[PDB]
Design a protein around this ligand. Structure first.
Ligand SMILES: CCCC/N=C1/SC[C@@H]2[C@H](O)[C@H](O)[C@@H](O)[C@H](O)N12
Ligand SMILES: CCCC/N=C1/SC[C@@H]2[C@H](O)[C@H](O)[C@@H](O)[C@H](O)N12
Ligand SMILES: *[C@@H]1O[C@H](CO)[C@@H](O)[C@H](O)[C@H]1NC(C)=O
Ligand SMILES: *[C@@H]1O[C@H](CO)[C@@H](O)[C@H](O)[C@H]1NC(C)=O
Ligand SMILES: *[C@@H]1O[C@H](CO)[C@@H](O)[C@H](O)[C@H]1NC(C)=O
Ligand SMILES: *[C@@H]1O[C@H](CO)[C@@H](O)[C@H](O)[C@H]1NC(C)=O
Ligand SMILES: *[C@@H]1O[C@H](CO)[C@@H](O)[C@H](O)[C@H]1NC(C)=O
Ligand SMILES: *[C@@H]1O[C@H](CO)[C@@H](O)[C@H](O)[C@H]1NC(C)=O
Ligand SMILES: *[C@@H]1O[C@H](CO)[C@@H](O)[C@H](O)[C@H]1NC(C)=O
Ligand SMILES: *[C@@H]1O[C@H](CO)[C@@H](O)[C@H](O)[C@H]1NC(C)=O
Ligand SMILES: [Cl-]
Ligand SMILES: [Cl-]
Lengths: 605, 603
């Protein structure tokens, strides 16, 4: 009979009747390839952590209603068993909103098919979908509960609900009742909110243990007092002690000094508190999984976060200094630590243009476009992530430049504009709502619109995407739209159909191959791909979407490439979808190339 | 149909009728695990070599008469097909004698069952043995000749015969005849000798193309003049251009500056000469495979050689330097070069004592010992490598110390002496032929004798090993011996039976685990022996070689990752011959350490 509980009498957890305090690190299994789960988890164990904490992003597991992903890189059950086999306990944060610098804070975009839905509230439509998601997810976690022989010792309900405007306590009571129904009356349920009464007001609930979060800039005494007002008795817990911080494109890369982190960790531990390091490994927002903040600013592909373990899982100075801190309180496992992986510079690899997006429309949109008088959103045309091509014809001669505009600032989030196959430039959420264009009356006007990531924090998480309001040309609303949802992922995996089915340039797919020898024990290795002369796009290797590149803005100039998607003898196909400008016109094919390097550049300006 | 031949008009080889010269590197498949054959060969290719050169060590393949090893790490045919697959031609050096700093120059020790055998000569028993061996090896090599669609473009007959005292030309002509019988009339056959008329005199032969060897210290024009005396027409060839040099235990690790090698290499190539770099990768003398020179000094376990590729295959500054030289003459292949392998320090691993050699004789010698009035050699008791225990009892009281001595210096090569289980010290070939001992009359006198490797060069390659002459005690010949050949390789593989200032020779064992499901573990490592003195080491039953931190220059031994497992613990076993750091009550001293860098140049 295995037990995990709060002992209110002695301000402690009890694990099997014995006092217990956790030292945890965040790892998001959705941001680490499964190939490397055990590697990251074993390094976390060797640092002295006795637990890990993760989020379950609902949108990562239920891409459309009733259609679930629980295998391979989506196998949360396996991740938790792996943690358990390593002797680690788990703090599960299943949401249903998780924030987390992740697309729409984890909420599936198809929730937005009800335009007026009030997310994270007792809206009956939101609740009905949450209920259905919890009926699938929770019974899976039940056998992984500590009391049932698994690792899961506590479970978070919602995520900083106190920061949201709605203050719907009915919603939190409904979550609590349903977590209880599926998981039982013994599991420790808790909430997390910023360490201040203003946040705790709407975040805390009778029957859910109130914890706080705070990083190196906060007064430790003040923070735990804010916690003590809601929980006079029980353990002190900091559920997200920030070891670093998130990035945005075009802003320099956030760091926090190792000393500051080590010093605050020591002081937190010295109080007897349980603590979780956010992040311990950050990893990667592969594909389109990044979030954004409001006013609109997308977080980049790397989630390195300046964590103790780097994006590719490397041991850093920070890691060793935090291990050292932990060692002052607990005995840390003996033996050598698993190393930073070897990285290899495969060097320069030439690409060439295969087809423009406009030429590949047949393969990108095999069931045909949707026609509409006025523009429809991504949600309305049944596309959540990536790109949607919006097409109409010019209703006037524009031999002299005519302004193309979105007067309500409804290009969400970027649009690459062409007229009869001539690029005209870019429309941008907030920054540029008007673009002058030229072409003849009746010319085809194309806007390739990119979802740069759904806001994951604040009031404006109901971020539909696409052209969310009208466009005008010379102040006259443009009508008669042909709208092509683009199955970029399928298409890239069929080599735009070539493999069957068993100043600006036009958005286009550029492809290239490189070989790695077989029979070499240390190849393939992890690497980093760099894009000198390119501008902004999406990159795949052998059909695995590595994420977004944007060396024009930085600070990230390289993307992490994990070894297990690379093949020997058989050619590795790189696909680059360049959106703005490719270095491939001049008759110097050598410039139309990418480079594999053996160190990240996520800092260079 | 493919042709390779000497054209005496262009002073050149012709490959398929067109001018060809080779730029080759030596790699010994016997000194690199097969797990790493493709790695080393591809790194060779990426340096711009169009060929490799290798020795076939006879004793690596015919350990006893008519018992053959050609599988796995002994799969020479596969190695040649691998070279070919990668676009490398092959210069084959099948011996039967190869020198090579390799046990007895490759010659099987069982040839010494004829005590009087004149090795590398017309001795009819030596020839009948060689002929039987050629009759197994050469039919295997015939399909791998260039003309039959394989990689092998030239074949060396013997090895520096000009340096051997015998000068038996009928021996050379016999080899020529047998190689021709098995391989045909088209294969280019050649010889290699030192670049000077004194060496060429007894090493060259009509019908065998004469080549020379030399290194960075020699006048290149004069070396090639000495070749031209013998072959006034044909390709200039340096068959062994020294990129480095051999070591001996107790002497400073040898090195040769990159600048010198690159400089000489460029000079050689510029003359249009074909050339082989000796070594390009050297590798390791695992188990007991190392040789020795006269006066007796054994070469160490590492054959790093200061080669362009390190013992563990790492890309060195020398490697990129010679690559850059080769690039001035031939387009080199494109793409990145396979990397130096990652190395991991597994840290400290504690061992404990398992059993002394003395207490282990049931398992080391399950057949029972051999009795003899006087001592017998390793050969006579049918053991070639490792250790033999010689046992007698003292015929007189020795309360006062008495001289135990080998008046004819007949301890080949080192003996660890105990009386009634009390260590007495060491007798050493050429260095310590007397040792005072004490004990009661009737006490057991034990001498654990080590074959430290059979001389591979010079007159004294007929190196039997063991107690090869009598031992005297207080000037009297000791008699009535009880001799135990020791099956160390089996006993270590069975964990010595049990299966679920000096110390007595003894085996120590410990375990360490490596986690599974970690994409980059296990890794290669280097094992180090702080506090130990001299011994042998096995990991998971694989004999990695000899350690001797007491003499150096080699401190660490190379440990290839593929013998390391994650599914069950890895066992280390040390046989320590002189002094183990394990008597103190601190168990933590009884230990070895794995580190991520080699120390082969200790001062
Ligand atoms: C106003 C400042 C909010 C506190 N800071 C951060 S830094 C990054 C994390 C994640 O967004 C996490 O999901 C959060 O729960 C937390 O929101 N958070
Ligand atoms: C005394 C020096 C003579 C030339 N040097 C060396 S250095 C190491 C090599 C090998 O022993 C080779 O087998 C021999 O053929 C060659 O002897 N050799
Ligand atoms: C933190 O606040 C407490 C009062 O709550 C104060 O006494 C203390 O000096 C403060 N410490 C720091 C480091 O600001
Ligand atoms: C568009 O063109 C007009 C001239 O007709 C000019 O006044 C305006 O600045 C231009 N707008 C942009 C956004 O470049
Ligand atoms: C477009 O224009 C008309 C206003 O005339 C309005 O009825 C319609 O809602 C607008 N649609 C969008 C998507 O903004
Ligand atoms: C890249 O490799 C794939 C798979 O063989 C092939 O379909 C494509 O045509 C290749 N391009 C080149 C230059 O090899
Ligand atoms: C080599 O010897 C030749 C004469 O045979 C001499 O002319 C030449 O200078 C020597 N070369 C070197 C580098 O010593
Ligand atoms: C060792 O041998 C020498 C030879 O002179 C002898 O005289 C000496 O007494 C011996 N020493 C011991 C400690 O037995
Ligand atoms: C040892 O001495 C004996 C008796 O003098 C002699 O017959 C024999 O040849 C010697 N044996 C060896 C191995 O030296
Ligand atoms: C294997 O390894 C450990 C060292 O961690 C050792 O203590 C143990 O005795 C070994 N196992 C057995 C069965 O002897
Ligand atoms: Cl988390
Ligand atoms: Cl060779």
């Amino acid at each position: 009979q295995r037990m995990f509980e709060i002992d209110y009498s002695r301000d402690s957890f009890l694990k099997d009747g014995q006092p217990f305090r956790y030292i945890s690190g965040s790892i998001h299994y959705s941001r680490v390839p499964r190939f490397y789960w055990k590697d990251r988890l074993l390094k976390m164990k060797m640092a002295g952590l006795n637990a890990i904490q993760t989020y379950v992003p609902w949108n990562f597991h239920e891409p459309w209603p009733g259609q679930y992903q629980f295998s391979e890189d989506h196998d949360v059950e396996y991740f938790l068993r792996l943690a358990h086999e390593l002797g680690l306990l788990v703090i599960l944060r299943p949401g249903p909103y998780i924030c987390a610098e992740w697309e729409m804070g984890g909420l599936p975009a198809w929730l937005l098919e009800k335009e007026s839905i009030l997310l994270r509230s007792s809206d009956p439509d939101y609740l009905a979908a949450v209920d259905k998601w919890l009926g699938v997810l929770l019974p899976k976690m039940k056998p992984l509960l500590y009391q049932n022989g698994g690792p899961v010792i506590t479970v978070q309900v919602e995520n900083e609900y106190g920061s949201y405007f709605a203050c719907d306590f009915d919603y939190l009571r409904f979550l609590q009742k349903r977590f209880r129904h599926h998981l039982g009356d013994d599991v420790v349920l808790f909430t997390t909110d910023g360490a201040h009464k203003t946040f705790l007001k709407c975040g805390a609930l009778q029957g859910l243990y109130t914890t706080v979060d705070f990083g190196t800039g906060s007064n430790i005494t003040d923070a735990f007092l804010s916690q003590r007002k809601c929980e006079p008795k029980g353990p002190l817990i900091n559920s997200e002690f920030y070891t670093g911080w998130l990035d945005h494109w075009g802003q320099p890369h956030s760091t926090i000094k190792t000393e500051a982190v080590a010093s605050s960790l020591y002081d937190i531990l010295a109080r007897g508190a349980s603590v979780n390091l956010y992040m311990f490994i950050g990893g990667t927002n592969f594909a389109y999984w990044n979030g954004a903040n409001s006013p609109y600013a997308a977080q980049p592909t790397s989630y390195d976060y300046d964590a103790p373990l780097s994006e590719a899982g490397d041991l850093t100075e920070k890691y060793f200094a935090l291990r050292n801190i932990i060692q002052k309180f607990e005995k840390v496992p003996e033996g050598p630590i698993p190393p930073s992986t070897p990285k290899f510079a495969y060097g320069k690899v030439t690409l060439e243009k295969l087809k423009t997006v406009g030429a590949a429309l047949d393969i990108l949109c095999p069931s045909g476009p949707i026609k509409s008088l006025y523009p429809l959103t991504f949600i309305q045309v049944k596309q959540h992530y990536g790109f949607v091509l919006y097409r109409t014809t010019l209703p006037q001669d524009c031999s002299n430049p005519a302004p193309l505009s979105s007067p309500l600032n409804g290009v969400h989030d970027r649009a690459y504009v062409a007229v009869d196959g001539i690029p005209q430039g870019v429309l941008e959420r907030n920054n540029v709502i008007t673009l002058n264009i030229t072409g003849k009356a009746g010319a085809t006007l194309d806007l390739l619109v990119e979802n740069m990531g759904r806001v994951n924090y604040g009031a404006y998480i109901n971020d539909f995407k696409g052209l969310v309001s009208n466009l005008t040309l010379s102040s006259n609303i443009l009508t008669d739209w042909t709208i092509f949802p683009l199955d970029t992922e399928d298409a890239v995996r069929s080599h735009l159909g070539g493999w069957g089915h068993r100043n600006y340039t036009l958005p286009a797919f550029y492809m290239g191959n490189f070989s790695i020898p077989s029979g070499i024990p240390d190849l393939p290795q992890d690497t980093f791909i760099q894009f000198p002369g390119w501008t902004k796009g999406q990159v795949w290797i052998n059909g695995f979407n590595l994420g977004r590149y944007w060396p024009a803005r930085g600070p990230q100039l390289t993307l992490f490439v994990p070894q297990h998607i690379l093949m020997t003898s058989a050619p590795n196909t790189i696909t680059v979808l360049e959106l703005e400008w490719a270095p491939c016109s001049s008759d110097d094919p050598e410039l139309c190339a990418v480079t594999f390097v053996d160190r990240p550049v996520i800092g260079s300006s």
